[PDB]
């Protein structure tokens, strides 16, 4: 009787507590449908697959770097010295049964953890969905990302391994030890000592496993309560206004769609660990200082950081006694690179004095300078993270080397000033044909008029039609309009049998008429919503 | 405007629904459920399709199960027959449980666009400034908890919590800390004229007069003599050797005092050199340092493999161009010239180690760096 | 009975921490200042005590600053001057860490006791049971979600996601958890009768037919030659002596392939023995276990340090009584008659090691012990 | 020396002792028999992040 | 947090080598040798390792 078995425990949860008050307005809260809206949760879901996989790592994990001959089933290092870590490494990748797997899928998720984060910070970013309520939530947002960028760098540095030691190497020991004022102290508290300090790497698993991992997760848990109880915002649409959230209730469909996607995601992240490889460290023999690779690349989300210290045209000062390595500039450059992107909002907000309360998001086209900054911001990334793979891409792509490093030194001046006169022109074009829909409608076939030769386009009025032909011009009200008669309904009856064998004419006749009848009612109930809302 | 004492009774589900959403102020409109018209084999085929993305991820889920618990994992080394299975053994533990957790993750999308009824439900966002009478309660409970309390007006106890909580905090942030500092300059790394801190030195400083630093080849064999000496012949005209400050002392690794000397020359960070055979046709394209003339034993140049740049190794060596490249940012130095940065973010020529031979031909250190040999820091170029 | 809407303005601060508490259901009894009397120096006196203890706090944190900062801490080798100063380095830490945040938390709890007012506040509990609309409510919204979403009607849907799920969660948990299990029964310990499981094994199990396992001392020498052949004379009467499995091959740890043989004979579990001189006065209260009649070498018992209760070293030796001791749950073992426990939780008596003289007189083992040595299992006394 | 006859106490003997699986539970939680090289580590991930969790 | 910033977990066989004479070339787990160096090597570690217990 699961009926009255549900029926006793509600009632038992409802003695015991009382929180069927709460537990209806997060049952009953909106969230909006837009597909846009789901690429935050991604990071979230694989953030979640990180932990689940990082536990299983942490039980066969072993951090130090005690040297220790391999003696294991890999016979291509065997006889090495190597620290325990990377023989504990070795082990999960071959001792235990799926341990390749699963690290694998880690690896896979983090990556994807960090593109999910950088393609939020898009959405969000061109979206202007920090403008004033949720200001914060992005710069809580903004150190998750640097946090998870940090992450992963100690992630794949934990393993000790000829890739990630030399990454380490650079890094973490020459910028730390670049710093003017303390360069040297920060590297020796850092490593205790001097680069291969013999406690670096349990203190990175210290950092790995619990303490940015316990950050993230404290700074994810206020992300999302704020848009939580600062109700996610939404693209302008017909029943929708700063003062309210068009949507799906959170239970009956919300819920249900957002656990399919976290399942979809861990599905995809299984696939890519299992069919795709990751961090092959067995190839990449123990970490020892005079031995090095040419393709020495961090993870993506770090590349950049790689890319902007080879473009930099190795500038120096030396001070009375004293010297500023040209590796202290990627520092300063990063801490720039976080302090504008931390503090983006009050600038945006500075300059254009915008402080209201926006609860409606903006199309990336309807703000052409923002959306230019961004699009010049991203082409700078993407040229300091292609040119952290410069080494690469002259391999594969034949490019001489100082081309490529040229290459990047010009265009990270350049290019960005190109792309942001594009984006602008772009956004502007696309409000103009916006505009152009709205003034004149959709496109159809052409036809040749009776008496004379003329061709015209057929166009097709989305609002009130004048005494003649033409009609009324609509307004722009923020949200996209149909530049297809594909998409609205036109041609949209297909045989509703099967992809094989029909269905009767009637049972056909019946779920079209059921559809049709229901986007009425849907459109209608829209416009209800609407004219009450105003008016 | 009630609260429905005793209508709630027979309100149906319906209407306690819209009630609900009437107190959450979230209005469902257009709530309809997917199939209006009962009967369609539509519907059937909708429902079947939904099963069988259920049924794929349970039989991929099986498939996990069976494959992971029954399959020829296991390193096999490599020509041995079997050794395919393994390779595409973690490929389908992958497979089978990405396909599975993603067909059930489709089979559950599709119910909800296709049996879980369509939904527009809009809902009253009250966001900012919390209306004037809590806003006001709110100040009134935290300035009658402020002045109540008597602060602000007991600048004895104000002054002397802040004071007990900046000398508390000071000291309990001092202790944490302290653990970690420590002085980059304590004079720990014994050498010839005294204990020197660390980057002052490197496996080439000598710890005693005329200390015998044999340029050691790194032979790669496992654990047993993995440094040997090395004579001028055999290293030929245009080739390189990655070589080690390896001492009489620092015996073969067989005895377990030793193996951890040679380990220490392995690990050293700044130890390893580079020793290139300069052409002799292009001994007249050579320059030399201040200081650094003779440094070349004839034709024979030692340069530290640790790139002056973020201090990764400068492996990579191009002769008939005579360039030191480093993988890790892609700096050229020049090696016929004193091996200065000719491309890259590199602005510090590498480190130049003087080398001759001492009796039995062997190369031998003549002496050590001149200039600390990684990468750059404050407290350099003095 | 109405919001106040513009009334709030007029309230007084007290007025509205009345409306918020009447909001909340909590209504505050007697909230009366600490000092209704003003000018009183009691109120001084009082003031001055509260900043006492904070400054007092304060100093204490500025004394831990000062003392982490400069203090002889470092270990001192005993005996060395200035050891007394670190002898108490920590204990200064901690003692003025501990004054400092006591003495704020004391000053705390004084200025509550003494200047912030008292009050009775009580609250409205509307614990359990949220009222009839709230559940009712709750009710419509999750029993419309459930069959709205149309499922306990699609009975091929439901039973394809339950079994898709059934059958992915097994497959999970089979893989999180097949790594951790290892068959404890995998023949991996090599052994003259083939390949054995590790428990049925240890460093006395001959590796090979007539191999020489010598019972062999651990001199605690810093690393070599911790191991040294053994003979009769060396044990006198009423002495005992641990032994480990020593070969011929695990030579001292001069060399790096040794000084791990060892180091494994050291950590073996199972391979430390007790080798006890019975006294010839006691040798005829000596009682034998059947199949050990002759493990005794004359006056000479080998008895598995290992106790046979959870498998704690059975270290301590009782000569006189011939009781060997385990400390982790006191367990007494008889060592004359054959090592069987006759206290204590231990059932099952320590497992003898056969032992023997062999060329030029050195204690070696006669052959394995004819049972398990560690503590008991499942898969024992079979 | 303390710390370690405790975990060779409890851990390896009882769960050693555990009729059915114990063996199998023990040779889990060491990789293997008591001085298991993965203890320690196992121990540090389970006290550090996983139980405090 | 703090000890998490010392201490090295394993059973890696090592000689001491460090302050404390009384264990100086024994053989001791890596985790045993940092236990040690937070007591005595680290300012404040026997501190904080006390006060941990
Ligand atoms: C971690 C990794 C993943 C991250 C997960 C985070 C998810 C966050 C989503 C938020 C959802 C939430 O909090 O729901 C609670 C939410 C409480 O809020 P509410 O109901 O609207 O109450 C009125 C508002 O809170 C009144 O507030 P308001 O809406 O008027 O505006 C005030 C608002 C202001 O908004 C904010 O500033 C929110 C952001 C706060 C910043 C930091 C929050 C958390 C940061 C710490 C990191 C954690 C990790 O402050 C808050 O409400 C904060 C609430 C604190 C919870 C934070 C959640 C985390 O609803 C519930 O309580 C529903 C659950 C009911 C539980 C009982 C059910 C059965 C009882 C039996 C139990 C045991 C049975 C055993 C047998
Ligand atoms: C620092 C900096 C920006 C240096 C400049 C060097 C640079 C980035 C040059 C561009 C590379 C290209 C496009 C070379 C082709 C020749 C060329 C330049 C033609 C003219 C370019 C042009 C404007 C043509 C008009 C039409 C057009 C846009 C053509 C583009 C053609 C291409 C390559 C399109 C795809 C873009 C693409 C994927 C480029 C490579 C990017 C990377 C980092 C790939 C990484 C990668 C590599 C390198 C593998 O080896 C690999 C092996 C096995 C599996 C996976 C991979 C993998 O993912
Ligand atoms: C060899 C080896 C070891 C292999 C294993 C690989 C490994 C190490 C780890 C991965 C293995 C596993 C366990 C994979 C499966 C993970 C898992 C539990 C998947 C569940 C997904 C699934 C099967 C769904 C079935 C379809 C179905 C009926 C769905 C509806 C019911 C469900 C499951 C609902 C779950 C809802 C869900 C994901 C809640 C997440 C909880 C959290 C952290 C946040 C919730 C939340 C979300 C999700 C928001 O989007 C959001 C947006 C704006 C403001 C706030 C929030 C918010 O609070
Ligand atoms: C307001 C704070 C005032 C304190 C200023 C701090 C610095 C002053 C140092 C001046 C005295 C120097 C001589 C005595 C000291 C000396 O000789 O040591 C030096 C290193 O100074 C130390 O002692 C530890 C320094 C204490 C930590 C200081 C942290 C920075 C402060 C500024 C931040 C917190 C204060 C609150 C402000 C922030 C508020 C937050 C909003 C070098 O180490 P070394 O010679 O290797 O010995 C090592 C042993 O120290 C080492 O503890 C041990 O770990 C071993 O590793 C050992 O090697
Ligand atoms: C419902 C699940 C249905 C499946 C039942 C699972 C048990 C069936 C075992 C059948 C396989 C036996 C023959 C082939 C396989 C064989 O011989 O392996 C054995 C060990 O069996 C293994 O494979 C790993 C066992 C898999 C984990 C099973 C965990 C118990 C299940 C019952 C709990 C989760 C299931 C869900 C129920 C709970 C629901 C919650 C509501 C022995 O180890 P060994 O010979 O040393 O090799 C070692 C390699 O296994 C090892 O992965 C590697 O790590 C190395 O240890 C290697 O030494
Ligand atoms: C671990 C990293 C992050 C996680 C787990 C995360 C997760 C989420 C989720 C699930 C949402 C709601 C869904 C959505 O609106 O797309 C959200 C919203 C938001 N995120 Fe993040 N995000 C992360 C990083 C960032 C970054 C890098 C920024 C910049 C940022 C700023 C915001 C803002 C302002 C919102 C509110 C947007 C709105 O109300 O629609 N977050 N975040
Ligand atoms: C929060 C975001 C996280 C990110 C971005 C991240 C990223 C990474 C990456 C990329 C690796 C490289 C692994 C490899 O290449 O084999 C790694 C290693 C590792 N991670 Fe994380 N991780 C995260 C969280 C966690 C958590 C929460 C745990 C533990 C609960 C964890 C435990 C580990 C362990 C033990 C390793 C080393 C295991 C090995 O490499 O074999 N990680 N991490
Ligand atoms: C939550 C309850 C906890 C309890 C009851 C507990 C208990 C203990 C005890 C008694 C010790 C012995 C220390 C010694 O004898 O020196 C210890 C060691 C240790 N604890 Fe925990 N602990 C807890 C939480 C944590 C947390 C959250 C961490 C990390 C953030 C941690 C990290 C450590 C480390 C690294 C050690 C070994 C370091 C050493 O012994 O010096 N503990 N723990
Ligand atoms: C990381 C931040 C980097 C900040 C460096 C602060 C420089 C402090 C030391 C300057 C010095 O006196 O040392 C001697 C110097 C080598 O002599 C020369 O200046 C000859 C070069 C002529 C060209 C000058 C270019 C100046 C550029 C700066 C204005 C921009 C800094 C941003
Ligand atoms: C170097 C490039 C590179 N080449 C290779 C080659 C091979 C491989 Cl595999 C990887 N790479 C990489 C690589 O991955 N680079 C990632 C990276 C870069 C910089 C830092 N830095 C953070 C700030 C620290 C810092 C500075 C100032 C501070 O001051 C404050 F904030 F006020 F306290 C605090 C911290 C210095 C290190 C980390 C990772
Ligand atoms: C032994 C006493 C003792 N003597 C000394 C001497 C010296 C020193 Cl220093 C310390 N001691 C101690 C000691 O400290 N004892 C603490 C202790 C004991 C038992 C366990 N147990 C966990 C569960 C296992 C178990 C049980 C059931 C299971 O089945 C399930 F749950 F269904 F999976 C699985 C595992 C048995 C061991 C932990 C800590
Ligand atoms: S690390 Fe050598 S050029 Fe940068
Ligand atoms: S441990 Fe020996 S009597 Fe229990």
Same mark, same amino acid.
């Given at each position: 009787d699961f009926a009255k078995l549900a029926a006793a425990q509600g009632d038992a949860i409802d003695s015991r507590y009382h929180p069927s008050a709460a537990v209806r307005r997060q049952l009953n809260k909106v969230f909006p449908t837009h597909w846009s809206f789901l690429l935050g949760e991604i990071a979230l879901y694989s953030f979640i697959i990180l932990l689940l996989t990082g536990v299983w790592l942490t039980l066969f994990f072993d951090p130090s770097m005690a040297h220790v001959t391999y003696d294991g089933v890999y016979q291509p290092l065997r006889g090495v010295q190597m620290s325990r870590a990377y023989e504990t490494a070795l082990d999960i990748s071959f001792?235990?049964?799926?341990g390749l797997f699963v690290r694998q899928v880690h690896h896979w998720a983090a990556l994807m953890f960090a593109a999910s984060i950088m393609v939020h910070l898009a959405r969000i970013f061109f979206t202007g969905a920090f403008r004033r309520p949720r200001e914060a939530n992005w710069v809580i947002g903004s150190l998750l990302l640097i946090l998870a960028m940090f992450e992963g760098f100690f992630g794949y540095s934990l393993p000790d391994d000829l890739l990630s030691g030399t990454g380490i190497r650079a890094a973490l020991s020459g910028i730390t030890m670049g710093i003017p004022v303390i360069g040297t102290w920060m590297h020796w508290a850092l490593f205790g000592g001097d680069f291969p300090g013999e406690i670096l790497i349990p203190r990175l698993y210290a950092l790995h496993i619990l303490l940015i991992p316990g950050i993230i997760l404290a700074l994810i848990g206020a992300h999302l309560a704020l848009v939580w109880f600062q109700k996610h915002t939404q693209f302008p649409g017909p029943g929708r206004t700063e003062t309210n959230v068009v949507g799906v209730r959170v239970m009956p469909v919300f819920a249900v769609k957002s656990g399919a996607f976290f399942a979809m995601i861990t599905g995809v992240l299984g696939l890519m660990g299992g069919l795709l490889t990751i961090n092959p460290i067995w190839n990449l023999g123990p970490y020892k200082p005079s031995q090095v690779s040419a393709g020495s690349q961090p993870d993506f989300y770090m590349m950049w950081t790689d890319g902007l210290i080879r473009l930099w045209p190795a500038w120096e000062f030396y001070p009375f006694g004293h010297t500023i390595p040209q590796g202290v500039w990627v520092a300063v450059g990063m801490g720039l690179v976080f302090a504008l992107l931390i503090a983006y909002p009050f600038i945006e907000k500075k300059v254009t004095g915008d402080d209201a309360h926006h609860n409606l998001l903006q199309r990336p086209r309807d703000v052409p300078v923002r959306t230019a900054i961004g699009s010049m911001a991203i082409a700078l990334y993407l040229l300091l993270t292609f040119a952290c793979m410069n080494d690469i891409i002259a391999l594969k792509?034949?490019?001489?080397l100082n081309a490529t490093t040229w290459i990047g030194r010009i265009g990270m001046v350049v290019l960005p000033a190109i792309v942001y006169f594009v984006a602008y022109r772009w956004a502007i074009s696309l409000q103009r044909s916006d505009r152009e829909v709205l003034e004149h409608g959709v496109e159809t076939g052409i036809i040749k008029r009776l008496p004379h030769g003329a061709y015209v386009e057929l166009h097709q009025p989305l609002g009130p039609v004048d005494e003649h032909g033409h009609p009324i011009p609509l307004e722009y009200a923020g949200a996209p309009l149909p530049k297809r008669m594909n998409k609205l309904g036109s041609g949209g009856a297909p045989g509703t049998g099967s992809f094989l064998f029909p269905d009767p004419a009637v049972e056909h006749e019946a779920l079209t008429e059921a559809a049709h009848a229901s986007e009425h009612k849907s459109l209608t109930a829209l416009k209800e919503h609407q004219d009450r809302i105003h008016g | 405007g009630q609260p429905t004492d005793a209508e709630l009774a027979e309100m149906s589900r319906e209407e306690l629904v819209k009630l609900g959403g009437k107190i959450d102020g979230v209005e469902t409109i257009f709530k309809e459920p997917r199939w209006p018209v009962p009967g369609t084999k539509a519907e059937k085929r909708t429902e079947r399709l939904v099963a069988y993305w259920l049924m794929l991820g349970g039989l991929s889920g099986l498939a996990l199960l069976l494959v992971f618990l029954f399959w020829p994992w296991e390193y096999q080394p490599f020509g041995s027959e079997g050794e395919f299975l393994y390779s595409l053994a973690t490929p389908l533990y992958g497979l089978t449980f990405g396909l599975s957790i993603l067909s059930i993750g489709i089979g559950a999308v599709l119910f909800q666009k296709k049996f879980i009824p369509e939904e527009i439900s809009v809902q009253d966002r009250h966001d900012g400034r919390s209306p004037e009478v809590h806003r006001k309660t709110v100040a009134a409970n935290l300035t009658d908890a402020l002045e109540g309390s008597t602060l602000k007006r007991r600048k004895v106890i104000g002054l002397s919590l802040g004071i007990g909580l900046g000398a508390f905090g000071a000291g309990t942030l001092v202790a944490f800390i302290g653990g970690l500092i420590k002085n980059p300059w304590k004079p720990v790394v014994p050498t010839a004229e005294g204990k020197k801190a660390v980057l002052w030195?490197?496996?080439?400083?000598?710890?005693?007069?005329?200390?015998? =630093?044999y340029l050691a080849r790194a032979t790669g064999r496992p654990g047993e003599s993995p440094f040997v000496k090395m004579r001028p012949e055999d290293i030929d005209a245009g080739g390189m050797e990655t070589v080690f400050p390896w001492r009489e002392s620092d015996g073969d690794g067989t005895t377990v005092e030793s193996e951890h000397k040679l380990t220490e020359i392995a690990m050293g960070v700044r130890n390893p050199v580079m020793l290139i055979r300069i052409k002799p046709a292009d001994m007249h394209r050579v320059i030399k340092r201040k200081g650094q003339e003779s440094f070349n034993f004839g034709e024979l140049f030692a340069y530290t493999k640790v790139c002056s740049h973020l201090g990764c190794p400068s492996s990579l060596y191009e002769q008939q161009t005579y360039r030191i490249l480093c993988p890790c940012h892609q700096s050229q130095f020049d090696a016929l010239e004193f *091996?200065?940065? =000719?491309?890259?973010? *590199? *602005?510090r020529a590498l480190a130049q180690l003087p080398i001759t031979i001492d009796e039995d031909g062997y190369l031998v250190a003549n002496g050590d760096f001149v200039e600390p040999v990684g990468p750059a820091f404050w407290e350099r170029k003095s």
């Open positions: 001792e235990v049964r799926g792509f034949h490019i001489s | 030195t490197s496996g080439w400083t000598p710890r005693f007069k005329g200390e015998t =630093i *091996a200065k940065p =000719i491309f890259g973010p *590199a *602005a």
